[PDB]
Amino acid sequence: EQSLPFFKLFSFADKFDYLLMFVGSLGAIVHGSSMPVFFLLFGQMVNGFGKNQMDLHQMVHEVSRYSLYFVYLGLVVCFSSYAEIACWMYSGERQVAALRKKYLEAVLKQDVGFFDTDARTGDIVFSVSTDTLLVQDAISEKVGNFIHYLSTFLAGLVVGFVSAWKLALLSVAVIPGIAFAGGLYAYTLTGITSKSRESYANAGVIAEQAIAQVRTVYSYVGESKALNAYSDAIQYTLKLGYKAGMAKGLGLGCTYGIACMSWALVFWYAGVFIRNGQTDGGKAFTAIFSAIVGGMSLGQSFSNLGAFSKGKAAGYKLMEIINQRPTIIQDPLDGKCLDQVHGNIEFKDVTFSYPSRPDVMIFRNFNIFFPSGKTVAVVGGSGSGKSTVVSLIERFYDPNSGQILLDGVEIKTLQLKFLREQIGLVNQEPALFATTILENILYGKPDATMVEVEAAASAANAHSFITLLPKGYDTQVGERGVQLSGGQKQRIAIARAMLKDPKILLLDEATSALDASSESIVQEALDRVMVGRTTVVVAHRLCTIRNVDSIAVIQQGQVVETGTHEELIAKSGAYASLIRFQEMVSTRLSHSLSTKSLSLRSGSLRNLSYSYSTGADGRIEMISNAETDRKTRAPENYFYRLLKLNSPEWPYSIMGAVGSILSGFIGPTFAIVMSNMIEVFYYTDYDSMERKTKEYVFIYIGAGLYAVGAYLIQHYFFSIMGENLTTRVRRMMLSAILRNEVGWFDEDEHNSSLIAARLATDAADVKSAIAERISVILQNMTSLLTSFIVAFIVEWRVSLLILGTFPLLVLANFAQQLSLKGFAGDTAKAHAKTSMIAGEGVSNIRTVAAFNAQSKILSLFCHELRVPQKRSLYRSQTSGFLFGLSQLALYGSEALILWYGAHLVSKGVSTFSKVIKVFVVLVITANSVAETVSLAPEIIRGGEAVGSVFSVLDRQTRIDPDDADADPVETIRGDIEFRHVDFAYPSRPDVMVFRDFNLRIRAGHSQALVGASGSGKSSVIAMIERFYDPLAGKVMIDGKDIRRLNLKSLRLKIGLVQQEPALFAATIFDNIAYGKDGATESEVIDAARAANAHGFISGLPEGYKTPVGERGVQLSGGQKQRIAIARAVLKNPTVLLLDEATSALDAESECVLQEALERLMRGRTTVVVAHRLSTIRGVDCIGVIQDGRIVEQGSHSELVSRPEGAYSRLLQLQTHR
User: In the UniProt record, which residues carry a glycan?
Assistant: First the structure.
């Protein structure tokens, strides 16, 4: 959308932030222009250490003078890498923690009807959670990395062009010759990466369907050919993944083969300009190296321009809610204040529409009147919009044409502290702020005393139930310290809206929690607060209103009738049908925020986003998403268990380990020839310097064709090895998912969109966990080892000093690689308690705006941001000092080697070019060694969070389908029998729909288990085939128990028909041959013409060929049912399990099942469950299920003959249409 500029993100800066962005900007220029000064000092040293080969006294002076200048360069990097980290990390905190304090004052002042849950308060909660971390990521510390590497580029061309300007043009005109050779590798590599994502989307829908339709995959035993369809379309991503490793051996080979043919260009012309007497050997080290790493340092300044554009995009959305001027405000000057209110609210000609969609007209010419000290009611029977009455006296909205008078004063002339202080609100599922149960009661009145809270808890039936909790009124209600998690809370607005002592008391439909003896206690609690208070009762169920003096009924825009309930029950005028309607009778936001973070977890770093959940009913839970360090849960043998699964490819790793050792020989051979030409440039013979610099160019060319054949063996192999491992894991993951129980799929984190990504992104990061961490270990250990064998043969006295110095060299470079990603570290974990307070004063804003609790949520937010700021003062002074002190042990420790090496030469032990070769080889080696020890924790710490998918492989199923020591199934005649069985779902095990259940079905009969308003009837057909096991008892079929049989050999003669049918992504020839494997063309036509749809399917373009499941022709609900019955008649089952529930016929003039119900019963055993009192005339028997038992049994000639029973009440529900 729109965007701010990059400036005005700094608009929350005070005069102490203009002082930290000034010191930390001078400190980043001086830190930047110091690597092109190391190349000016190490160049001028060699001109004194190497021109003085015949004067062994000048050598000691002109090295001890320049080895003091590395301690002075060490101090300037010490106190200027401290100033670009401690100033840009702490001044990026103080500016974004003053954006949080003003964005939250803005979202406490907007109108309360702005938040109507339709992904409006799912962006406000998301903008305070993530858009504030993107502003901080932009402006804090990636601004100092911009100035650091931009000033090196500017100062690599001023050191480079003053020493020798003809070699600072040759070593700059090579840089377009390399970045173009490497910008064609990274173009074609994305083009094969994009085709691999497209090739998996064909096989990405087979796992998508067979997890979503898992009731049909198990019922028709076809969980073996859901693999053979999957394991034939994975094989088109494997072969496309082979030639994305050959585009990487040819991309790193032909980049290190041009860069090694470009030192040969610029070390030749450096060796011509010396022979003409224009440069020397230290003005050609300065000119070449300061103009290459100066030019290369633009690839790091422009790496930070991605975060600067996400920062401008996110920071607009914040800066447009801050200055959005609202409508309903408080006027401290244009406001009144009455005295002795009475509570006479009269909606006198009030019309109103919802400003989200102005189409309907809720209150066209609405009129009611509220007396003082009385109890009125507002009740409808449908969507009258009656709960808008309590949402309008609050002034959450405005009547767009009308007026509302409080004791004869229009309420648009009243300030919102004389109004909301007089109105107490009790609502649906009331907001419990995660504090004590003493501070929640003190929102109705902020500070009076202690004994009035006990008085207010006494007249609410609450004084007893919070002393039988083992803490003295101090109980954290958010997290389960003591579990007062009952459905009967003290509905603590009943305790709040008495302590406040309101004059007008607006109740609501505060009985929606499966009313029982517990909800009868709060009913007689509400009947003692309604004394002398002009209360309304928005009521949905009429049972709670039956003893009230005056009741008013509204139906469409206006009141219809008023008066007592002795004349309201009279005349039958639009109330007698409503009591007939009484006789015939959050978790969304945590899912919405995860999908909104869906789409962008593809990239944001893991230290910057969240993972959202509900937790308990205290708040919305926000785990920092850097939960991988805390997790540390892989099996302890996991690196050995992935090498056993990837060991039929042993010839593709014995041939790949002789391609990764040969690549370690190019490191030191670069640094032996380059340190042999520093010696050559100081000859005094100008023809033995010519024919010895030809033969160091021919090695640079021959090692630019050795680096093409040795990166092609390392990368083509080890990608044949790692792509037969992602393919083998994917076939082992889906074959283990389709073995579990059905209740495992019913859980909240096992829907077929979070579990089909574990086969796509969690099985594709096993390639980069056991194949790309042996390539860079065999390479980096054969270069560490071959440069400590050379260095002890050239000279062993200096190279023993570099062994003791070697921890001080690999630690200075370990810190120079953490600095490229930043030292702040997991900034989404400190700002997590702050957001859970900001994220509960948005979704509970109906209860924050009432009670005038808007200056208390801002106090709990500003008194708590002091913890993430003192965490960042202690970190930025410590991390900026340990980084600035490890750099003094890099330059101060190369001053010791070059002094002790220039000590032995004056005593005649060593020579020149025995000290330089040892110095150049062992320092370039130390950069690679501090990369093996940077991927060292991930090898130990459980791989990572996505290499820890053994939870689908190492998981034990509850219901085991295939057993060898189980009795097989040959012929089931049908002897359905239940003994004493009780059963509950594992999703909510408190509900106990079965309680000692009993049935008995003989062979060759039917069963017609009745509706009873959905009294847990849709679980008998979920136990004839083992979708669920019973908790206690047996299920007897054919005289044998059901937990003794081969389950795959049983379900091929028990075939159901689903509630709402579903169709796979194939033609209508495999969607009706899915339940007979085998059938070809004779009994496919015959099984069509039973519930026919045959002239329906004869009219079709490609015969019987069209995709009908998805991405094809869209059929109707009356035609999908005629497909699914063609399945269940080709299979020829013996125990037919029909199904109807929840009014899903979806067809007028029903005939698609009427042909089925009379034809398909004629030789089978059927179990028909339906909620309607029709079509269930199974002429053999019919039982009535109530409360987990049967109450009456007998067919439709002895079940209607009895006078009442329980079936005749459902016979009265026939004519209630």
Answer: 607, 724, 751, 780
